[PDB]
């Protein structure tokens, strides 16, 4: 996250870190046994880390649970990042508490102008590199589909939305991939892609979770 703030330990209790020996992506806990992330985060040998603040120090609220199964959306296109969504099933159910909690799926798509919270352990610099150890937060609005299409001509599908600031300076970034965009207490987005980070007229692009609720629920019911 570029231009964000330190969330505070366990203030984003649905945030997960996907670990393959190191943090490589975020995700969101959607019930005691399932995580949603970006399909571009797919790899084998995922450990889900819940209750994290400092990903390099055991602080006491962590749950580390191996993935038993990953399900990439059947229509994920790695070239266009259309349908950039994946489900991860945990080997055992998380213990839910004030610091480890699921985030509700939306019943409705959020409108442009809606304020959202984006969070992650990604790069904090738009140029060069500095990876924070503790979770970073950004409040950003959802942008109109027209401003999103103008920023990324020919690249925005109906499964994507833009959020952030056209002036630049505040954005999700490398390592934030897969993480949550929460709006009005619902999961609305997944950190998916952009042209760099925090660049003028290049807002972040997010997977539009409200389009996937049917697929998520039916997949969870059967797996």
Catalytic residues, by residue number, are: 40, 84, 177
With respect to ligand 6SO, which residue has the nearer C-beta, 99 or 136? 136
DSSP string, 199-210: BTTB-EEEEEGG
- Strand order from edge to edge, sheet including 5-6: 5-6, 136-141, 115-120, 180-183, 186-193, 204-208, 160-163
**Is 127 annotated as belonging to a binding site?**
no
Tell me whether residue 54 or residue 157 sits nearer to Ca ion (CB atom).
54
16 among annotated binding-site residues: no
- Number of neighbours of residue 44 by Cβ within 10 angstroms: 7
Judged by CB under 6 A, the stretch of 5-13, 143-151, 192-200, 213-221 that binds ligand 6SO is 192-200
Task: Single out the segment in contact with ligand 6SO by CB under 6 A; choices: 74-82, 104-112, 154-162, 193-201.
Answer: 193-201
Distance CA 61, CA 167 (A): 37
Query: Which structure tokens are listed for 117?
Result: 């919270």
Distance CA 17, CA 27 (A): 6
Is 174 labelled as part of a ligand binding site?
A: yes
Q: Is 211 in the site for ligand 6SO (CB under 6 A)?
A: no
Q: Binding residue for ligand 6SO (CB under 6 A) from 191, 209, 212, 216?
A: 191
Residue 197 touches which of ligand 6SO, Ca ion, none (Cβ within 5-8 Å per kind): ligand 6SO
Q: Residue 179, interface with ligand 6SO (CB under 6 A)?
A: no
* From 27, 171, 189, 209, residue interacting with ligand 6SO (rule: CB under 6 A): 171
User: Is residue 222 annotated as involved in ligand binding?
Assistant: no
Element (H, E) at 137: strand 136-141
Distance from the Cα of residue 23 to its chain's centroid:
13
How far is it, in rounded angstroms, from Cα 156 to Cα 137?
A: 25
C-beta closer to ligand 6SO: residue 90 or 173: 173
Using rule CB under 6 A, residue 177 touches ligand 6SO: yes
175 appears as a binding residue in the annotation: yes
- Residue number with CB closer to Ca ion (19 or 123): 19
- Which of 162, 221, 206, 198 lies closest to 4, judged by CA? 198
Query: Which of 14, 34, 193, 212 touches ligand 6SO (CB under 6 A)?
Result: 193
Q: DSSP letters along 5-67, please?
A: EE--TTSSTTEEEEESSSEEEEEEEEETTEEEE-GGG--SS-EEEES-SSTTS--S--EEEEE
Q: Verify binding: residue 190, ligand 6SO, rule CB under 6 A.
A: no
- Interacting residues toward ligand 6SO by CB under 6 A: 171-174, 176-177, 191, 193-194, 196-197, 204
């Amino acid at each position: 996250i570029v231009g964000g703030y330190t969330c505070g330990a366990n203030t984003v209790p649905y945030q997960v870190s996907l670990n393959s020996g190191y943090h490589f992506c975020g995700g969101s806990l959607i019930n005691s046994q399932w995580v949603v992330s970006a399909a571009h985060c797919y790899k084998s040998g995922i450990q889900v880390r819940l209750g994290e603040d400092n990903i390099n120090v055991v602080e006491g609220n962590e749950q580390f649970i191996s993935a038993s199964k990953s399900i990439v959306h059947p229509s994920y296109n790695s070239n266009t990042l259309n349908n950039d969504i994946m489900l991860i099933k945990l080997k055992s159910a998380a213990s839910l508490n004030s610091r480890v909690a699921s985030i509700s799926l939306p019943t409705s798509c959020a409108s442009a102008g809606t304020q959202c919270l984006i969070s992650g352990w990604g790069n904090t610099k738009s140029s060069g590199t500095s990876y924070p150890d503790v979770l970073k937060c950004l409040k950003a609005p959802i942008l109109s589909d027209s401003s999103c299409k103008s920023a990324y001509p020919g690249q925005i599908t109906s499964n994507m939305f833009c959020a952030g600031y056209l002036e630049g300076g505040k954005d999700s970034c490398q390592g934030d991939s897969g993480g949550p965009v929460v709006c009005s207490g619902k999961l609305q987005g997944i950190v998916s892609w952009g042209s760099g980070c925090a660049q003028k007229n290049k807002p972040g692009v997010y997977t539009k979770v409200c389009n996937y609720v049917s697929w998520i629920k039916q997949t969870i019911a059967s797996n």
